[PDB]
Design an enzyme around this catalytic site. Structure first.
Site, PDB file in Angstrom:
ATOM      1  N   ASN A  46      -0.578  -5.323  15.070  1.00 19.79           N
ATOM      2  CA  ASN A  46      -1.228  -6.639  15.369  1.00 19.79           C
ATOM      3  C   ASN A  46      -0.419  -7.157  16.630  1.00 19.79           C
ATOM      4  OD1 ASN A  46      -2.332  -6.569  12.699  1.00 19.79           O
ATOM      5  ND2 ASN A  46      -0.320  -7.009  11.675  1.00 19.79           N
ATOM      6  N   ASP A  52      -0.210  -3.302  10.061  1.00 21.65           N
ATOM      7  CA  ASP A  52      -0.667  -3.178   8.883  1.00 21.65           C
ATOM      8  C   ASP A  52      -0.908  -1.883   8.585  1.00 21.65           C
ATOM      9  OD1 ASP A  52      -1.181  -5.952   9.174  1.00 21.65           O
ATOM     10  OD2 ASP A  52      -3.499  -5.648   9.601  1.00 21.65           O
ATOM     11  N   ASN A  59       0.588  -6.133   5.663  1.00 21.04           N
ATOM     12  CA  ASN A  59       1.469  -6.424   7.031  1.00 21.04           C
ATOM     13  C   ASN A  59       2.958  -6.364   6.639  1.00 21.04           C
ATOM     14  OD1 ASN A  59       1.777  -7.833   9.310  1.00 21.04           O
ATOM     15  ND2 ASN A  59       0.245  -9.310   9.191  1.00 21.04           N
ATOM     16  N   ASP A 101      -0.449 -14.926  -4.313  1.00 19.34           N
ATOM     17  CA  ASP A 101       0.674 -16.008  -3.492  1.00 19.34           C
ATOM     18  C   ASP A 101      -0.104 -17.351  -3.310  1.00 19.34           C
ATOM     19  OD1 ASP A 101       2.909 -15.948  -1.515  1.00 19.34           O
ATOM     20  OD2 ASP A 101       1.303 -16.012  -0.041  1.00 19.34           O
TER      21      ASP A 101
END
Ligand code: CL
Ligand code: CL
Ligand code: NA
Length: 129
Positions: A46, A52, A59, A101
Protein backbone atom coordinates in the site's frame (compact mmCIF):
# COMPACT_ATOMS: atom_id res chain seq x y z
CA UNK A 1 -2.68 -21.93 -3.78
CA UNK A 2 -5.10 -20.62 -6.47
CA UNK A 3 -8.60 -21.84 -5.54
CA UNK A 4 -11.35 -22.41 -8.02
CA UNK A 5 -14.50 -20.40 -7.47
CA UNK A 6 -16.68 -23.26 -6.08
CA UNK A 7 -13.63 -24.81 -4.35
CA UNK A 8 -13.21 -21.59 -2.34
CA UNK A 9 -16.98 -21.25 -1.75
CA UNK A 10 -16.96 -24.74 -0.22
CA UNK A 11 -13.94 -24.04 1.96
CA UNK A 12 -15.32 -20.71 3.15
CA UNK A 13 -18.62 -22.43 4.14
CA UNK A 14 -16.69 -25.20 5.93
CA UNK A 15 -14.73 -22.45 7.79
CA UNK A 16 -17.90 -20.64 8.84
CA UNK A 17 -18.14 -17.57 6.63
CA UNK A 18 -21.54 -18.22 5.05
CA UNK A 19 -23.81 -15.54 6.50
CA UNK A 20 -21.14 -14.50 8.97
CA UNK A 21 -22.39 -11.16 10.36
CA UNK A 22 -25.17 -11.44 7.76
CA UNK A 23 -22.91 -11.60 4.70
CA UNK A 24 -23.95 -14.39 2.36
CA UNK A 25 -21.23 -16.62 0.91
CA UNK A 26 -21.31 -14.89 -2.44
CA UNK A 27 -20.16 -11.62 -0.76
CA UNK A 28 -17.07 -13.44 0.51
CA UNK A 29 -16.28 -15.15 -2.78
CA UNK A 30 -16.77 -11.96 -4.73
CA UNK A 31 -14.42 -10.13 -2.25
CA UNK A 32 -11.75 -12.87 -2.60
CA UNK A 33 -12.05 -12.73 -6.40
CA UNK A 34 -11.22 -9.06 -6.63
CA UNK A 35 -8.84 -8.82 -3.67
CA UNK A 36 -6.65 -11.82 -4.69
CA UNK A 37 -8.06 -13.58 -7.79
CA UNK A 38 -8.41 -16.51 -5.36
CA UNK A 39 -4.61 -16.80 -4.77
CA UNK A 40 -3.66 -17.43 -1.19
CA UNK A 41 -0.06 -16.10 -1.81
CA UNK A 42 -1.18 -12.66 -3.13
CA UNK A 43 0.66 -9.71 -1.44
CA UNK A 44 0.33 -6.04 -2.43
CA UNK A 45 2.15 -3.01 -0.95
CA UNK A 46 0.00 0.00 0.00
CA UNK A 47 1.16 3.56 -0.61
CA UNK A 48 1.37 4.10 3.19
CA UNK A 49 3.97 1.31 3.50
CA UNK A 50 1.61 -1.32 4.84
CA UNK A 51 1.04 -4.53 2.82
CA UNK A 52 -2.06 -6.61 2.18
CA UNK A 53 -1.75 -10.40 2.49
CA UNK A 54 -3.68 -13.46 1.18
CA UNK A 55 -7.05 -14.39 -0.19
CA UNK A 56 -8.67 -11.45 1.46
CA UNK A 57 -5.78 -8.93 1.33
CA UNK A 58 -5.64 -8.32 5.08
CA UNK A 59 -3.65 -5.18 5.96
CA UNK A 60 -0.49 -5.16 8.16
CA UNK A 61 -1.42 -1.60 9.38
CA UNK A 62 -4.06 -3.04 11.67
CA UNK A 63 -4.46 -6.77 11.51
CA UNK A 64 -1.26 -8.82 11.25
CA UNK A 65 2.45 -8.47 12.00
CA UNK A 66 4.91 -8.27 9.12
CA UNK A 67 7.76 -6.55 11.03
CA UNK A 68 7.98 -3.61 8.60
CA UNK A 69 4.86 -1.53 9.15
CA UNK A 70 5.59 1.47 11.35
CA UNK A 71 3.25 2.25 14.05
CA UNK A 72 0.88 -0.56 13.57
CA UNK A 73 -1.19 -3.08 15.28
CA UNK A 74 -1.60 -6.79 14.91
CA UNK A 75 -5.26 -7.05 16.02
CA UNK A 76 -5.63 -10.64 14.70
CA UNK A 77 -2.49 -11.62 16.62
CA UNK A 78 -0.81 -13.45 13.80
CA UNK A 79 2.24 -13.12 11.54
CA UNK A 80 1.16 -11.79 8.06
CA UNK A 81 2.87 -14.78 6.51
CA UNK A 82 0.25 -17.10 8.12
CA UNK A 83 -2.31 -15.34 5.89
CA UNK A 84 -0.61 -16.85 2.80
CA UNK A 85 -1.22 -20.53 3.67
CA UNK A 86 -3.03 -22.95 1.36
CA UNK A 87 -5.23 -23.54 4.45
CA UNK A 88 -7.45 -20.54 4.85
CA UNK A 89 -8.14 -20.85 8.59
CA UNK A 90 -5.94 -17.88 9.61
CA UNK A 91 -7.41 -15.61 6.92
CA UNK A 92 -10.96 -16.62 7.81
CA UNK A 93 -10.47 -16.17 11.59
CA UNK A 94 -8.99 -12.69 11.04
CA UNK A 95 -11.64 -11.65 8.49
CA UNK A 96 -14.33 -12.58 11.09
CA UNK A 97 -12.77 -10.00 13.41
CA UNK A 98 -12.40 -7.37 10.67
CA UNK A 99 -16.05 -7.72 9.52
CA UNK A 100 -17.20 -7.50 13.17
CA UNK A 101 -15.28 -4.19 13.70
CA UNK A 102 -18.30 -1.91 12.97
CA UNK A 103 -18.04 -1.20 9.21
CA UNK A 104 -18.94 -4.62 7.94
CA UNK A 105 -17.50 -5.60 4.62
CA UNK A 106 -16.84 -1.92 3.65
CA UNK A 107 -13.43 -2.64 5.23
CA UNK A 108 -12.60 -4.35 1.91
CA UNK A 109 -12.53 -1.40 -0.49
CA UNK A 110 -12.84 -3.82 -3.50
CA UNK A 111 -15.91 -5.39 -1.93
CA UNK A 112 -17.42 -1.94 -1.59
CA UNK A 113 -16.54 -0.86 -5.11
CA UNK A 114 -17.11 -4.11 -7.05
CA UNK A 115 -19.35 -6.48 -5.02
CA UNK A 116 -21.60 -4.38 -2.80
CA UNK A 117 -25.10 -4.11 -4.27
CA UNK A 118 -24.43 -6.60 -7.09
CA UNK A 119 -25.86 -10.07 -7.80
CA UNK A 120 -23.23 -11.68 -5.53
CA UNK A 121 -25.19 -14.95 -5.47
CA UNK A 122 -23.81 -15.53 -9.02
CA UNK A 123 -20.39 -16.16 -7.42
CA UNK A 124 -21.74 -19.40 -5.87
CA UNK A 125 -24.05 -20.43 -8.75
CA UNK A 126 -23.48 -24.09 -9.79
CA UNK A 127 -21.39 -24.94 -6.71
CA UNK A 128 -21.85 -28.11 -4.64
CA UNK A 129 -21.59 -26.70 -1.06
CL1 CL B 1 5.52 -3.85 11.93
CL1 CL C 1 -23.05 -5.03 8.35
NA1 NA D 1 1.06 -4.77 11.73
Amino acid sequence: KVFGRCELAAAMKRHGLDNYRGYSLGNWVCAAKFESNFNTQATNRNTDGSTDYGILQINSRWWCNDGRTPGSRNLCNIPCSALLSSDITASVNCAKKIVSDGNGMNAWVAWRNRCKGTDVQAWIRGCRL
